[PDB]
Amino acid sequence: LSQFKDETNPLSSLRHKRRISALGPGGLTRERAGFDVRDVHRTHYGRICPVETPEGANIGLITSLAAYARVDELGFIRTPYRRVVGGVVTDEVVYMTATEEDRYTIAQANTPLEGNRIAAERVVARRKGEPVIVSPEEVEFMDVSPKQVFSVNTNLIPFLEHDDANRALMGSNMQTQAVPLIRAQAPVVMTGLEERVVRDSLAALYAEEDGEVAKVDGNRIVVRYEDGRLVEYPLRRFYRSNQGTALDQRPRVVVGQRVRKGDLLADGPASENGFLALGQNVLVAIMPFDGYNFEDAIVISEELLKRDFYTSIHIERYEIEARDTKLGPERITRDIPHLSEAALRDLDEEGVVRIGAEVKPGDILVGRTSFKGESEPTPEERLLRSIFGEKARDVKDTSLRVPPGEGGIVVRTVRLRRGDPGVELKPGVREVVRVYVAQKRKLQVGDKLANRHGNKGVVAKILPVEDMPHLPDGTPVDVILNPLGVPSRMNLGQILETHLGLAGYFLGQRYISPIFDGAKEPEIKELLAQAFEVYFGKRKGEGFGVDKREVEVLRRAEKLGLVTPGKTPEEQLKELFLQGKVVLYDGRTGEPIEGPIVVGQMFIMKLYHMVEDKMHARSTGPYSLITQQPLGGKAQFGGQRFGEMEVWALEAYGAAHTLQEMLTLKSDDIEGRNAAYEAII
C-alpha cells in the first residue's frame, strides 16, 4: 500500500494522495471478483470518478476520489447536497452518506432556476439511483456541481460532455504524464480548477500575509509582512523528483512590489501564474498529411523547436560504490589504467568528473579500479605484459561510465566517504559517489503527444516551415492532426476546443468553460463572428481583397453544401469560418487545399519518458551465472524475451534454423555462441 511518489508533474503528485485501492490486506486479483467490484456502482455518484482508473489488468481495482468527496469521522464517503424546500432552493448544504442519500429525491445540477426559485415543469431527478422526470414539490435536495461527479484529473477536460468516457479516461490519465515544459503554458480553454489545483498541490509559492517585497533573485525572496516579519523564502531550485522531472520555483514579483495575502510570489514548475501549466497551446490544422500521420502518428512544424516549445529539463542520478573485497579494497582513483589521457580531461577531480562537463555515452562519470582475476596473471598475459613492462597492476577498469544512449551535462556531484557527518554507511562499502546529469530535451521524432480528450500519438515527422500549411496572412500551422483518429474515438471536445481556439487566437483571449455548464454551439460561432473581424475585417484595410485561390475553393465549398450559393465571395468565407474551417494553402506548391480545413488553437502536452520504453539494443554482453541465459549490465542491455508466442510465430513460418538459433546460438548454447562470434568476426 506504500509506494514511490508519482511526481511527473504537480497534478500527478496530487492524484496519488487521492488514490483508493482494494488490494494489499483485502482480497486481491487471484480471486478477482470481476464484473462485480470492478463495475462502477450506482452509489459512486460523487464518491468516485466513474471515469478514472488504470488501463488493462488493474481496471476498476485502483480508483480516484471524486472532486467534492469527503471522508467522515467514521470513514464513509460523503458528497454534498444542498437542501431544497417547496421548490425554493436553499444554500444550506448537507454532506449525506451513501445510505442517507437513498432516503431522498435529489435533483440534477442543471435545473433551470429563477433566483431561489425553480422555473421548471418537469424536473430531472435521481430517486435512489433511478432517474425520473418529476414535479418541483417532490424535490428535497439538489446537486451542487456537475463537477461533484468526477475526480480532479477528469474535471480538467473542457467539453467533457461531448467526449466519450473511454477516450476521456485516457485524458484524465495522461495528464499524470505531463512533464513540466520550460515554457509551461496553462491551456487556452480552461475548466476552472486550474488555479485551485496549483494552490492545493503546493505547486507555486504564495504570500501568507499582506506586505512589501524586499528581495528577488533566482535564489530566494525576502518579504516584509504588515506585522513586521521579514521572512526569507528560498526558491527551491533545480531539484530532482522521483521521476527526474525538475521541481523548482521561479519568481513572478519585482522589488518593493506591494502585495496582498495569497498573491503569487513564485510560479510552480508547471504553473503559469498560479494556473496549472501542463503543456502548450498550439495552432493545429486537423487533416491528413501524406501518410506522415498514418495511425495516430502526428507531424511537427520545425518552428516548434526553435521556440523551445516542447523542450524539457531532466535530472538523472547515478551512483558508484567503493566496496571492500576479499581480493583487496577497490578505489575511486582518477588514475584508471588503460591507453588514454586526452580522454581524462573533464575528469581530473581526483576520481570524479568536474561539475559543468558535457557527457556523451562512454565517457566516464566516476573512475574506479578493482582487484580482479585471483592474484596471478593469465598464462597468456604473463607472457604478454612482460614485453611492455609487466607492472600488470592487479586493478581493473570498473569505472562508472555513461550508459549508452545519451547522458547530458553535469550539474552536481556528491562525494561521501565513511559517512562520518551523520550519513548511514553501507556494510562493506568504503565510500559512494553520486553524480547528477541534466539535459534539456527538445521535441523529436518519437516524442509522444497528448490532449485532454484522449489523443495520443508520436511525432512521426518534423517538417521544415517551408512545407507547412499556412493561413492567408502567412501564419503557418504548428501541428497536423489526421482526422481519422476521431470518428471512431468519438471525442468531439477536441473539436469544440479547436474552434474556440481559432476565436481566442484572434480575439486575443482565453476562456473558462466549466465541466457540464460551459460554452455552447451558438456563443462559439458568435465568438468566431467577432474573431472574423480581427482576422479578415482588417485584411482589406491593408489593401488586399480576396485571393484567386479562395475563388477556386469557395466553388467546391458551396457544392459540398458548406456555404450559401448566392451570398458574396466575402461573406461566403465568414459562414465558412463560423464552422471552424478556414482556407489553407499547401505550403509546398502554394496552391490551396480543395475544401476548407478547420484550423484553430488546441492545447497539447509532451508525454513523459520511461526508461523501460527507452531505445534498446544488444549485440552481445553478460550472461546469468546459473541458467547461462543473457543478462543486463548497466552499459549493457540484455536481450529480448523470446516468449512461447514468438516461438510459434516462426514454427508457422517454417523458419527452421532461425528458430533453433534463437533457442541456442543466441541464448543457452555455451559452446556455440563463442563458436558463432568468431566465425562472424
Partner 1 sequence: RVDYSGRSVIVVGPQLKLHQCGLPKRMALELFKPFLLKKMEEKGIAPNVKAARRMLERQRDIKDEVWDALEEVIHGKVVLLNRAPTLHRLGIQAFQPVLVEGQSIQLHPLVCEAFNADFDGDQMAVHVPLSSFAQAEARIQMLSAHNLLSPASGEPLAKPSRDIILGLYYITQVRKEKKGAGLEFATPEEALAAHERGEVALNAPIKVAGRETSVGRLKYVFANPDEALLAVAHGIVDLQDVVTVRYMGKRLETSPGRILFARIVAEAVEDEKVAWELIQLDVPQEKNSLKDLVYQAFLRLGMEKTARLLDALKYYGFTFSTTSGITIGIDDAVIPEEKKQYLEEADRKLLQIEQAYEMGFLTDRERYDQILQLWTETTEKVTQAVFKNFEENYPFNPLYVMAQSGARGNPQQIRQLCGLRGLMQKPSGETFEVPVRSSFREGLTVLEYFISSHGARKGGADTALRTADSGYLTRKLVDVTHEIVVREADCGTTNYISVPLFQPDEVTRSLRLRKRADIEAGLYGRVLAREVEVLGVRLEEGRYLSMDDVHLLIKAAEAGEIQEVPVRSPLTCQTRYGVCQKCYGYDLSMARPVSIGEAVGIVAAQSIGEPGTQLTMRTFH
Partner 2 sequence: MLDSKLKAPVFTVRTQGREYGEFVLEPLERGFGVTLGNPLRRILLSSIPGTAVTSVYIEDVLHEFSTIPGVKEDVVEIILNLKELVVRFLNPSLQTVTLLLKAEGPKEVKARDFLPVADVEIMNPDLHIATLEEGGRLNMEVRVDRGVGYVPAEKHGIKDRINAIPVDAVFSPVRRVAFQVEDTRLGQRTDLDKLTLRIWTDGSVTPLEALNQAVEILREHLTYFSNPQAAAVAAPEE
Partner 3 sequence: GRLIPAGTGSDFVRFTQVVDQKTLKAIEEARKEAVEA
Ligand X SMILES: Nc1nc2c(ncn2[C@@H]2O[C@H](COP(=O)(O)OP(=O)(O)O)[C@@H](OP(=O)(O)OP(=O)(O)O)[C@H]2O)c(=O)[nH]1
CB of 14 to partner 1, least distance (A): 23
CB closer to partner 1 out of 377 and 595: 595
Which one of partner 3, Mg ion, partner 2, none is in contact with 660 (Cβ closer than 5 to 8 A by kind)? partner 3
529 binds partner 3 (CB under 8 A): no
649 forms part of the interface with partner 3 (CB under 8 A): no
At closest approach, how far in Å is the CB of 490 from partner 1? 5
All cell numbers assigned to 642: 523470446
Q: Interface with partner 2 by CB under 8 A: which range of 129-137, 277-285, 302-310, 317-325?
A: 302-310
Q: Which stretch binds partner 2 (CB under 8 A): 125-133, 214-222, 274-282, 320-328?
A: 214-222
Which residue spans within 138-278 are E strands per DSSP? Answer: 141-143, 189-190, 205-206, 211-216, 220-225, 230-234, 239-240, 246-247, 250-251, 264-267
Residues 6+ apart with CB under 8 A from 17: none
User: How many residues at the interface with partner 2, by CB under 8 A?
Assistant: 48
Tell me the closest approach of the beta carbon of residue 365 to Mg ion, in angstroms: 11
Distance CA(676)–CA(681), nearest Å, equals 9
CA distances from 169 to 51, 53, 55, 94 (A): 5, 7, 9, 29
- Strand, coil or helix: 111: coil
**Exposure of 552 in the CB half-sphere (CA atoms within 13 A):** 10
For position 534 contacting partner 2 by CB under 8 A, the verdict is no
- Tell me how far, at minimum, the Cβ of 484 lies from ligand X, in Å: 8
User: Quick one: which of 22, 109, 134, 182 contacts partner 2 (CB under 8 A)?
Assistant: 182
The CA distance from 98 to 72, in Å, is 11
By CB under 8 A, tell whether 607 contacts partner 3.
no
Residue 547, binding choice from partner 2, partner 3, ligand X, none, Cβ under 5 to 8 Å by partner class: partner 2
Tell me how far apart the alpha carbons of residues 393 and 159 are, in angstroms, rounded to a whole number.
Answer: 70
Q: Give the count of residues interacting with ligand X (CB under 6 A).
A: 2
| C-alpha pair distances (Å), 491 with each of 54, 165, 180 | 19, 9, 25
Our finding on whether 100 is near partner 3 (CB under 8 A) is: no
Rounded least distance, CB 215 to partner 2, Å: 6
The answer to whether residue 615 forms part of the interface with partner 2 (CB under 8 A) is no
Q: Which does 255 bind (CB under 5 to 8 A by kind): ligand X, partner 2, Mg ion, none?
A: partner 2
Specify whether the CB–CB gap between 319 and 333 falls below 8 A: no
Partner from Mg ion, partner 1, ligand X, none binding residue 403, C-beta < 5-8 Å depending on class: Mg ion
Q: Based on CB atoms, which residue is closest to ligand X, 295 or 358?
A: 295
Q: Which does 330 bind (CB under 5 to 8 A by kind): partner 1, partner 3, ligand X, none?
A: none
* CB closer to partner 3, 57 vs 626: 626
Q: Which is nearer to Mg ion, 311 or 439 (CB)?
A: 439
Stretch binding partner 2 (CB under 8 A), from 271-279, 299-307, 380-388, 632-640 = 299-307
Alpha-carbon distance of 268 to 10, in angstroms, equals: 8
| Contacts with Mg ion, residue ranges (CB under 5 A) | 403, 405-406
Contacted entry of partner 3, ligand X, Mg ion, none for residue 133, CB cut-off 5 to 8 Å set by kind: none
Residue 464 sits in the site that holds partner 2 (CB under 8 A): yes
Q: How far apart are CA 405 and CA 611, in angstroms?
A: 11
355 binding partner 2? (CB under 8 A): yes
Residues 442-501 that bind ligand X (CB under 6 A): 488-489
> Grid coordinates representing 141?
435536495
597 binds, among partner 3, partner 1, partner 2, none (CB under 5 to 8 A by kind): partner 1
Interface positions, 219-238, toward partner 2 (CB under 8 A): 219, 237-238
Q: Is 465 in the site for partner 2 (CB under 8 A)?
A: yes
CB-nearer residue toward partner 1: 331 or 666: 666
The answer to whether residues 54 and 174 touch, using CB atoms and an 8 Å cutoff, is no
Instruction: Please list, in sequence order, all residues whose beta carbon lies within 8 angstroms of the beta carbon of residue 568, skipping any fewer than 6 positions away.
Output: none
What cell does 545 get? Answer: 481583397
Q: Please give the torsion angle defined by the CA atoms of residues 479, 522, 484 and 306, in that order, rounded to the nearest 10 degrees.
A: 0
> What is the smallest separation between the CB atom of 647 and partner 3, expressed in angstroms?
10
**Which residues are registered as beta bridge partners of 282?**
602
306 interacts with, out of partner 3, Mg ion, partner 2, none, CB within 5 to 8 A per kind: partner 2
The torsion of the CA quartet 67, 513, 505, 176, rounded to 10 degrees, works out to 20
Strand partners, 233: 221
Q: How far is the CB of 436 from ligand X (least distance, A)?
A: 40
Q: Single out the residue of 657, 678, 679, 680 in contact with partner 3 (rule: CB under 8 A).
A: 657
Residue 26 per-residue DSSP state: S
Task: Give the Cα-Cα-Cα angle 575, 576, 582 (nearest 5 degrees).
Answer: 140
Q: Is residue 254 within 8 Å of residue 265, measured between CB atoms? A: no
Beta bridge partners of 370: 396
Q: Judged by CB under 8 A, does residue 546 bind partner 2?
A: yes
Closest CA to 10 of 148, 238, 199: 199
Q: With respect to partner 3, which residue has the nearer C-beta, 621 or 672?
A: 672
- Burial bucket for residue 18 (CB in 10 Å: 0-12, 13-18, 19+): middle
Shortest Cβ 602–partner 2 spacing (Å): 21
Distance CA 618, CA 65 (A): 44
In the bound state with partner 2, the residue whose beta carbon lies nearer, of 456 and 470, is 470
Show the cell assigned to 635. 552499459
- Per CB under 8 A, the list member of 251, 659, 666, 673 interacting with partner 3 is 659
342 part of the interface to partner 2, by CB under 8 A: no
Q: Which residue has the cell 539535459?
A: 439
Grid cell in block for residue 61? 481495482
**How far is CA 191 from its chain centroid?**
18
273 binds, among partner 1, partner 3, ligand X, none (CB under 5 to 8 A by kind): none
Write down the least CB distance from residue 674 to partner 3, Å. Answer: 16
- Least separation, in Å, of the C-beta of 641 and partner 3? 17
CB of 502 to partner 1, least distance (A): 10
In degrees, rounded to 5, the angle at the alpha carbon of residue 52 between the alpha carbons of residues 48 and 56 is 130
For residue 590, state whether it binds partner 2 (rule: CB under 8 A).
yes
- In three-state secondary structure terms, 358 is strand
> In degrees rounded to 5, what are phi and psi of residue 231?
-100, 135
- Say which residues have a Cβ less than 8 Å from residue 237's Cβ, sequence separation at least 6: 218, 219, 248, 249
Q: C-alpha cell of 239?
A: 531539484
Whether 20 contacts 26, CB under 8 Å: no
Alpha helices in 271-329 (DSSP H): 303-306
d(CA 292, CA 526): 35
Q: Which of 311, 514, 668, 676 is close enough to bind partner 3 by CB under 8 A?
A: 668
User: What residues line the site for ligand X (CB under 6 A)?
Assistant: 488-489
Return residues touching partner 2 (CB under 8 A).
182, 215-219, 237-238, 250-251, 254-255, 302, 305-306, 308, 313, 355-356, 409-411, 438, 440, 442, 464-467, 470, 472-475, 541-549, 587-591
Chain residues binding partner 3 by CB under 8 A are 651, 653-657, 659-660, 663-664, 668-669
